[PDB]
UniProtKB/Swiss-Prot annotation:
Superkingdom to which the source organism belongs: Eukaryota
This protein's name: Fatty acid-binding protein 2
GO CC terms: cytoplasm
Modified residues (N-acetylserine): S1
Family: Belongs to the calycin superfamily. Fatty-acid binding protein (FABP) family.
Expression across tissues: Midgut.
Alphabetical keyword list: Acetylation, Cytoplasm, Lipid-binding, Transport
Length: 131
């Protein structure tokens, strides 16, 4: 049901904490926390496409479930990303110089909840989006 819908950020918790654990610069942290991103996912048979707007601009990237690839996320951070698509749960594992982070995306109707964990901190961050 989530395919083709645009989800917009409505609220977030502990996101600043998570970014600190990532060792990002203060200006990047400020820009990310102030962003009001949107995201739309599409299925293309063999691959999926994710279109995002906000900080770091507008982009559409394609990927296959289970395959790692070189990527750039956030405000220009270089990482190795790997997404696993399993029904209504999309898990994005990212490996960067700072460590590893997991972004668990759960879709339920018009709501999308993203739970984020990091290898450098014990807190849990949440991003709530609505279509
Ligand atoms: C320990 C982290 C290593 C990788 C570095 C990650 C840098 C963080 C910037 C990522 C923001 C991505 C937005 C979260 C995803 C979502 O909201 O759906």
């Amino acid at each position: 049901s989530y395919l083709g819908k645009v989800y917009s950020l409505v609220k977030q918790e502990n996101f600043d904490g998570f970014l600190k654990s990532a060792g990002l610069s203060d200006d990047k942290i400020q820009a990310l926390v102030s962003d009001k991103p949107t995201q739309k996912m599409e299925a293309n048979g063999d691959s999926y496409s994710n279109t995002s707007t906000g900080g770091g601009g507008a982009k559409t990237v394609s990927f296959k479930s289970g395959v790692e690839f070189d990527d750039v996320i956030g405000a220009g951070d270089s990482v190795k990303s790997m997404y696993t698509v399993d029904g209504n749960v999309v898990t994005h594992v990212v490996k960067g110089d700072a460590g590893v982070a997991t972004f668990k995306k759960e879709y339920n109707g018009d709501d999308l909840v993203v739970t984020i964990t990091s290898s450098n901190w014990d807190g849990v961050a949440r991003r709530y989006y609505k279509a």
